[PDB]
Design a protein around this ligand. Structure first.
Ligand SMILES: [Cl-]
Lengths: 104, 542, 316, 774
């Protein structure tokens, strides 16, 4: 999962296991087809690291990003729900692109 | 084609409303043959849907016989008041009454009586010397529509059976058009009671035709036509096939029993969706079945739904396919979860059949009146330079990232309009091949970004100075951010038309152009040989 | 309170003068249009039941000559209010649309037809006969035959089971007690409607109920009435033979006997209305039928029950 | 490429295709398909929906489709759940329950409909955020921006609603008003709006009737807007009816407390009487020994005069409340003051001004007009479904109600497998709830049995587990109480119509509609006397069909063709046994009817008792033992492919059940001693059917019993494939009841050949190892 630094942050504070991370994301397909955005509903996403709630690419990007850092995450189809992706939205074996900003 | 269709039975339950129970009484006379039938008068009984005559055959007993062999000795029956043993020129006197008189049918050349062989409730009918004490029959006259429909059924069955098997193409065309006009629904502007009467008659005729196996005959005709057409005459063949599909749709439209009977051929109907000429008729028949028959939705599988979706994919954007899918999702207020899930999983995630919608930000481009050209024998300098200061950028003002690109655009074709455009709209610098732009992370040209490394790479934020250099000689375009050179460039583009600085943006930005001199002091030193853009102004210009 | 204030003043408000049809005319036309729609089965319509009930209640609302004449004119005005808006044709259409199946809609339809036909309204009779001869509606007579064949008679097995349950110290509900002679009010309403069609020696309807000339099928209503009378007579004979060997008759037996005698009185009145005038065809139809067997059985029951019930003072 | 959506104002083909695309979007998530709705949130999100519902240049079809899509994705499921659980009024007794007043003040002026405290148990709805990373019913929506936006849109639509305006939103007045009114009604049914919002809506509808002391109803409208207004007014009528029910319950609580205090004081005065008369004390004790319902009836019947023990003050209070209730219900020109007058005048004016061309509008208008003059009848219908509970029984009831709601939401779904598991778990959660087996009257008011019957009818088939769960629920429901048994007995004809389902599978005993039909008549002498001859004749017809041809389900599995079906015949015989025998005594009428029906169709008796070829009962039992000894006949051939049905034991069980039914059809001895001819006839028929030699021979058949091996092991034979002691009990019952033992020699013969070997065989199984075997 390659990470592109759209906007660097503090570079010192990092999320830990069991700590809630308030982030804003924008998930789209590799072809440019947007499917999810927390900013459209104005509700930032909160999840705890270590519970494996999010996919492996999203968790790796959240662990790698610092406080106040916006980054592009490329999730491979192996970690993008495998070949059993979310029907009706995400076709199977699809590369996902996320634009994640770590608010807290 | 059935070998046992010539046997005669006493049947009870539903048989009294079909067209197989209809017999014509034909006197042995030509003049005054529509007059009153007396007791003991000879006649023939003709079966309407087959055209055969009741007869005493040589080998078997009582049987239906062909018209070519129905002589008077074989086919002669009379009505007797009891089992107790002239041809005038007029209407005669009424003797036999409908519904009241009890008639004993007696063969004349033998003296036998039409009895039932002693055993659903289905008695074999024979000719016996003595017979039973309940051999009497009661006559009931049918309506004109039933007998007309039965004769039409016989003629159509003969024609389509000889068509299935030179071939009377014009007779087939006229018969198909007459049958389509025969099953025509009443017009919507008709009065309510007349409309209901015509709907009742249409439903009765559809039931009469279904009970004699005309749907299966039309299906065999369609199969035979497809076999013939797979192996002008072709125009007539496809016209006959189109009329056959219209006849099938007219036969099953609005009738629940015919659609429930036809739901068994769902695989056949779905499998015949590939052809171009047969697609619309098959779709109309399928929609009629799905509207009327509720069990057809239960019989729908995944391959059928994929075939309908592939029809939508291969034939274009037709909303009747969407209507068929909507009918597949719900039937009379009951939601079929399997059909809903299959449609959602096989139509939605591809995102290439249905039109897409989104909310996008509006993007505008602003330029200074500084135009640079390349021509033979021209007094135009070729190296130019300008700067842009970003005072304030508010990213995610409108839940979408803020557009902000800066660069060079050629006057040959850079004509951005607000609103729609290529891709998802929001067209700025680098969204066509006439503009070359930088956004802090990527190089944009032809609406395709290329990520380019730089020292402390980030999007264009506040207090950022972007320096753009254009060398029209090579030609080449290069960028610098805060004095640090960006490790990428544009080259080998068309030098026709006039080049101008340009910035494209969405809402939430504040920028400042610096072109040198009295029009913005540069925050960084321009490269060697590169002239500031304000020197390109005419002396009589502002 | 509910048995007195329901639908108390809606009918005068509907016809109150402020569309060429008034609201009452519009709802009657809506019900007629629903009745004329070709369906396999008359589906349940609570709106029709409520509105036909309130129409029948609107029509149904010594003495001096002036008081009786004013009462007759008031009844004529109340029936004109409904039949000038197409109610009689709607009643015939709903009876035809019943397809011979009993339902609350059939009950309210027969009650409304009785209400607009009460007193032998000759205008309503003429409108009904004109509709039936113009439309050639054989479904009306098929449904009449089907409704007449489904009418109930005395049920002695249900009576014995009820007596056993009451002897085992169980309190019987109203629905249980209404099983010996079930839907007797509907039977009385049906034969009262058939009687009111012929009231006033209306010989055209008297001949039309026997043979329907011009229609595809013909149903003899007189013979159907005789058939139900014969079934009821057989049931009453069974009840008498149940009670023949007992000294007294209890309250349940008296209740069921009174119901059966009321139904029989209505049927005799209907037959008398069929044949009076005189109607030669209906008299010859009655002579060549099974009426005389019913007469013999009724004479047996009359003589024996007369002698039995004259000897006790609790059976007056 | 992309264009503006407003460019569909002229491109008709793409506009039609996108309108039908929006219709398909609404169709694929219809009737609570939550997964598809979450998938659809990734195609049209909330920002797009808000933009589309706010936009005024959008085409009318697109505007209607976007409003419908918003309602379908986010609001339809909650509205459906509110509409399902709306005809029942379950009210707990709290301190806030007493606070409901019929009138808001002493001025006797009506309060606004929908405004005020509501004391009823209406369960809520659950929402969750549509996040495709990492689902609870409908997708999340702010519901506070939305209701404010809907109110502002309705106000703006009403303000710009002149007849002279030449640019209505969507192209017509219908396109401007109908989607907004649909959204307003959907949010009203869901209970989203508070009192100020309802006040704004009422002022927009009619500012004179709902004033503080023009509107939509007094404008020239299309018929679709009239349909939406009719729906809104019907909702207001429902709110007023619920308010009346809650006020009645509050006054009932206060009156019940006062009556309890007064009766306590009167009883204390009565027991303190030193020299009370014997007759008065006896009458007072008889009054106080009545059931509590009889006590309430005696206290409330004011027509009894001196016989009613109610003091005058309580009678005055009840008279005042009855007068207030009858005035509030509109039971006893000018501008309207109440909702009833406004609705009546509006419907009459609409029908007078135009001839309505839509049948649905005629139906809605006249239904709404008729229900304004049926206030007492509607109040009675509401009070029949009103129930009152306690505080400690609230929370479980809520859970129960939620489960019931889910089951009702599956009445319009064609058998989703996830929905099937959800329905099975919902039935399991209902059966385990304390209120289910502690408040059967509440379960009958809620109509759980009718809903489960509807589910089972809709399945009937290809889903045996759902039918089994429904049948277990209905059997337990019958076993709870006698009134529940009568309620399920009302559906016996339809239970017996589909009663040939699942009888071949031995694992579905107690889980078939025949078992539900049996459980509704089991040991109820009142209901067994309520049976009908056509029902028993239907069961006998099924039994005769079982005695003629083999079972296709068993014939497919490779069992030998014995020529008849002894597996389901035992089930029909068991139902007939439950019909003819109640509480250790036979029902004479049912027994005579069953015997007559069985002898009119002797193929029910099986191949042994058919006559003219039948070998006999004892010969049949010996042949079944021989069949059980041969594995080729008892079982299918090896290689032909959870509980196998041995054929010999099946034949034995059929004949045992037949003899049990015939022995329980015998008349009682008190019928014989009175010399009743029918009892003698029935007993003579039963004696002619089965001779004594067959019964004594079957009783004398030796049994195979477990033994102790020489190695110390226990060798238990298979009881599901062998002749069992339970096959001899019907023989003893038939011999005792039909023939009887009255001669010493016959008793000693029966003891010598039949009973003493069984007694010795049970004495020989009294070792330490063999005593506890089955
Ligand atoms: Cl012919």
């Amino acid at each position: 999962v390659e990470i592109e630094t759209i906007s660097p942050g503090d570079g010192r504070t990092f999320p830990k296991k069991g700590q809630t991370c308030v982030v804003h994301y924008t998930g789209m397909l590799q072809n440019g087809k947007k499917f999810d955005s927390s900013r459209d509903r104005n509700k930032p996403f909160k999840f705890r690291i270590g519970k494996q709630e999010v996919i492996k690419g999203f968790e790796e990007g959240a662990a790698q990003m610092s406080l106040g850092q916006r980054a592009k995450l490329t999730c491979t189809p192996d970690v993008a729900y495998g070949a059993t992706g979310h029907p009706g939205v995400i076709p199977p074996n699809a590369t996902l692109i996320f634009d994640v900003e770590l608010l807290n | 084609n059935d070998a046992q269709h010539r046997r005669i039975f006493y049947e009870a339950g539903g048989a009294g409303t079909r067209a197989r129970s209809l017999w014509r009484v034909e006197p042995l006379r030509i003049s005054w043959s529509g007059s009153n039938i007396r007791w003991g008068q000879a006649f023939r009984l003709r079966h309407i849907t087959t055209g055969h005559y009741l007869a005493l055959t040589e080998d078997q007993g009582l049987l239906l016989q062909d018209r070519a062999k129905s002589d008077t000795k074989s086919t002669a029956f009379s009505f007797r008041a009891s089992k107790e043993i002239r041809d005038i020129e007029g209407m005669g006197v009424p003797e036999i009454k409908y519904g009241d008189s009890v008639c004993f049918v007696q063969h004349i050349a033998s003296g036998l009586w039409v009895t039932y062989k002693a055993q659903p409730l289905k008695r074999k009918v024979i000719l016996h010397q003595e017979g039973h004490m309940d051999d009497g029959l009661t006559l009931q006259r049918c309506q004109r529509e039933e007998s007309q429909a039965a004769r039409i059924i016989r003629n159509t069955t003969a024609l389509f059976s000889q068509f299935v098997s030179t071939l009377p193409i014009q007779e087939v065309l006229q018969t198909l058009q007459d049958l389509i006009a025969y099953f025509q629904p009443p017009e919507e502007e008709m009065q309510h009671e007349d409309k209901q009467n015509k709907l009742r008659s249409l439903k009765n005729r559809q039931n009469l035709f279904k009970e004699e196996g005309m749907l299966a005959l039309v299906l065999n005709c369609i199969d035979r036509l497809n076999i013939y057409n797979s192996v002008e005459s072709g125009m007539a063949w496809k016209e006959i096939l189109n009329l056959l599909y219209k006849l099938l749709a007219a036969l099953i439209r609005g009738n629940r029993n015919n659609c429930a009977q036809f739901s068994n051929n769902l695989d056949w109907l779905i499998s015949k969706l590939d052809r171009l000429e047969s697609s619309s008729g098959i779709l109309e028949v399928l929609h009629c079945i799905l509207i009327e028959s509720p069990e057809a939705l239960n019989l729908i599988a995944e391959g059928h739904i994929k075939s309908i979706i592939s029809l939508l994919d291969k034939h274009g954007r037709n909303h009747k396919v969407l209507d068929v899918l909507c009918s597949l999702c719900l039937c009379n207020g009951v939601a079929v979860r399997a059909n809903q899930n299959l449609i959602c999983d096989n139509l939605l995630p591809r995102r290439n059949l249905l039109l897409q919608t989104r909310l996008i930000n509006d993007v505008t481009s602003i330029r200074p009146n500084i135009f640079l050209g390349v021509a033979e024998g021209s007094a135009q300098y070729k190296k130019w330079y300008f700067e842009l200061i970003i005072d304030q950028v508010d990213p995610f003002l409108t839940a979408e990232p803020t557009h902000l690109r800066v660069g060079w655009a050629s006057s040959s074709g850079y004509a951005p309009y607000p609103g729609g455009g290529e891709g998802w709209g929001g067209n700025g610098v680098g969204d066509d091949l006439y503009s070359y732009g930088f956004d802090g992370l990527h190089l944009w040209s032809g609406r395709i970004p290329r990520a380019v490394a730089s020292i402390n790479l980030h999007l264009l934020r506040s207090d950022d100075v972007v320096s753009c250099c254009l060398d029209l000689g090579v030609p080449s375009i290069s960028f610098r951010i805060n004095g640090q050179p960006v490790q990428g460039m544009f080259e080998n583009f068309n030098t026709d038309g006039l080049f101008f600085p340009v910035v494209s943006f969405s809402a939430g930005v504040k920028v400042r152009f610096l072109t040198g001199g009295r029009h913005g002091e540069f925050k960084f030193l321009p490269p060697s040989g590169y002239a500031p853009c304000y020197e390109a102004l005419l002396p009589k210009e502002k | 309170v509910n048995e007195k204030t329901q639908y108390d003043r809606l009918i005068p408000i509907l016809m109150k003068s402020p569309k060429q049809p008034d609201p009452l005319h519009q709802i009657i036309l809506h019900f007629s249009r629903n009745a004329l729609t070709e369906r396999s089965k008359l589906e349940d319509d609570p709106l029709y039941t409520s509105y036909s009930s309130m129409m029948a209640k609107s029509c149904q609302s010594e003495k001096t000559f002036e008081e009786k004449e004013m009462e007759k004119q008031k009844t004529l005005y109340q029936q004109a209010r409904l039949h000038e808006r197409g109610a009689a044709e709607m009643v015939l259409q709903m009876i035809s649309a019943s397809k011979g199946e009993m339902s609350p809609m059939v009950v309210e339809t027969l009650k409304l037809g009785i209400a607009i036909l009460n007193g032998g309204n000759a205008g309503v009779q003429q409108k009904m006969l004109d509709y039936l001869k113009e439309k050639k509606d054989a479904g009306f007579f098929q449904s009449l035959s089907g409704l007449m064949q489904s009418c109930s008679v005395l049920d002695l097995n249900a009576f014995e089971r009820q007596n056993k349950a009451e002897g085992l110290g169980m309190v019987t509900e109203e629905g249980t007690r209404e099983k010996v002679l079930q839907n007797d009010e509907f039977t009385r309403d049906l034969f009262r409607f058939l009687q009111l069609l012929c009231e006033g020696h209306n010989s055209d309807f008297q001949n039309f109920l026997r043979t329907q000339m011009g229609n595809t099928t013909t149903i003899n209503v007189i013979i159907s009435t005789v058939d139900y009378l014969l079934r009821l007579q057989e049931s009453i004979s069974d009840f008498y033979w149940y009670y023949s060997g007992k000294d007294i008759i209890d309250e349940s037996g008296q209740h069921n006997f009174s119901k059966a005698l009321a139904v029989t009185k209505q049927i005799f009145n209907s037959l008398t209305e069929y044949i009076q005038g005189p109607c030669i065809g209906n008299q010859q139809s009655l002579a060549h039928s099974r009426l005389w067997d019913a007469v013999v059985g009724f004479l047996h029951v009359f003589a024996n029950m007369q002698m039995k019930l004259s000897q006790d003072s609790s059976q007056i | 490429r992309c264009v503006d959506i407003l460019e569909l104002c002229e491109q008709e083909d793409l506009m039609q295709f996108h309108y039908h695309t929006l219709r398909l979007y609404s169709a694929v998530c219809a009737l609570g398909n939550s997964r598809v709705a979450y998938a659809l949130c990734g195609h049209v999100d909330l920002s797009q929906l808000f933009y589309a519902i706010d936009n005024k240049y959008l085409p009318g079809l697109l505007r209607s489709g976007f409003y419908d899509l918003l309602i379908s994705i986010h609001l339809a499921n909650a509205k459906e759940r509110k509409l399902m659980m709306k005809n029942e009024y379950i009210i707990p007794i709290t301190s806030a329950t007493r606070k409901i007043r019929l009138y808001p003040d002493e001025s006797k002026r009506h309060g606004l409909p929908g405004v005020g405290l509501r004391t009823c148990l209406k369960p809520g709805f659950r929402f969750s955020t549509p996040c495709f990373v990492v689902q609870k019913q409908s997708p999340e929506i702010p519901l506070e921006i939305l209701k404010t936006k809907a109110l502002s849109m309705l106000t703006e639509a009403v303000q710009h609603s002149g007849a002279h305006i030449r640019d209505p939103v969507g192209g017509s007045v219908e396109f401007q008003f109908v989607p907004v009114l649909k959204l307003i009604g959907t949010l009203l049914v869901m209970g989203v709006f508070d009192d100020d919002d309802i006040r704004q809506i009422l002022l927009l509808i009619d500012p004179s009737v709902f004033g503080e002391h023009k509107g939509l109803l007094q404008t020239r409208l299309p018929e679709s807007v009239k349909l939406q207004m009719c729906e809104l007014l019907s909702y207001l009528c429902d709110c007023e009816l619920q308010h009346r029910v809650e006020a009645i319950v509050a006054f009932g609580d206060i009156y019940v407390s006062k009556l309890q205090a007064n009766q306590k004081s009167r009883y204390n005065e009565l027991m303190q009487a030193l020299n009370m008369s014997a007759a008065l004390t006896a009458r007072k004790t008889r009054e106080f020994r009545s059931p509590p319902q009889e006590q309430i009836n005696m206290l409330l019947n004011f027509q009894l005069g001196e016989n009613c023990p109610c003091p005058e003050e309580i009678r005055e209070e009840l008279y005042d409340f009855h007068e207030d209730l009858l005035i509030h219900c509109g039971v006893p020109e000018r501008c309207p003051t109440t909702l009833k007058e406004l609705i009546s005048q509006t419907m009459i004016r609409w029908a007078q001004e135009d001839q309505i061309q839509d049948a649905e509008l005629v139906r809605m208008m006249f239904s709404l007009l008729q229900r304004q003059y049926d206030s007492i009848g509607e109040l009675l219908q509401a009070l029949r479904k009103t129930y009152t509970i306690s505080q400690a029984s609230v929370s479980d009831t809520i859970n129960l109600l939620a489960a019931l709601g889910q089951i009702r939401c599956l009445l319009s779904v064609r058998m989703g497998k996830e929905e099937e598991l959800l329905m099975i778990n919902g039935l399991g959660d209902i059966m385990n709830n304390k209120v289910f087996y502690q408040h059967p009257n509440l379960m009958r008011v809620l109509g759980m049995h009718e809903t489960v019957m509807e589910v089972m009818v809709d399945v009937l088939i290809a889903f045996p587990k759902m039918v089994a769960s429904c049948c277990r629920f209905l059997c337990y429901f019958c076993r709870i109480s006698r009134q529940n048994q009568k309620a399920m007995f009302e559906h016996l004809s339809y239970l017996l119509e589909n009663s040939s389902v699942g009888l071949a599978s031995p694992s579905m005993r107690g889980s078939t509609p025949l078992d539900v039909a049996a459980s509704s008549v089991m040991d109820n002498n009142e209901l067994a006397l309520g049976l009908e001859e056509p029902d028993l004749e239907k069961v006998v017809t099924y039994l005769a069909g079982c005695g003629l041809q083999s079972c296709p389900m068993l014939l497919a599995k490779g069992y030998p063709d014995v020529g008849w079906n002894p597996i389901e015949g035992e089930r029909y015989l068991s139902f007939l046994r439950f019909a003819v025998f109640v509480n250790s005594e036979s029902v004479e009428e049912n027994a005579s009817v069953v015997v007559k029906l069985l002898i009119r169709r002797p193929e029910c008796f099986g191949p042994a008792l058919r006559g003219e070829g039948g070998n006999g009962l004892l010969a049949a039992m010996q042949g079944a033992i021989k069949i059980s000894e041969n594995p080729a006949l008892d079982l299918p051939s090896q290689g032909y492919k959870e509980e196998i049905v041995h054929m010999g034991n099946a034949i034995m069980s059929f004949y045992s059940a037949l003899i049990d039914l015939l022995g329980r059809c015998a008349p009682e001895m008190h019928l014989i001693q009175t010399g009743k001819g029918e009892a003698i006839r029935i007993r003579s028929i039963l004696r002619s059917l089965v001779p004594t030699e067959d019964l004594v021979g079957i009783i004398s058949i030796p049994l195979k019993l477990p033994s102790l091996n020489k190695d110390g092991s226990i060798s238990e034979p298979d009881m599901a494939a062998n002749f069992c002691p339970d096959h001899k009990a019907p023989m003893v019952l038939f011999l005792d009841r039909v023939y009887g033992i009255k001669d010493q020699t016959f008793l000693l013969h029966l003891l010598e050949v039949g009973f003493l070997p069984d007694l010795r065989a049970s004495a020989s199984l009294d070792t330490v190892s063999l005593s506890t075997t089955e």
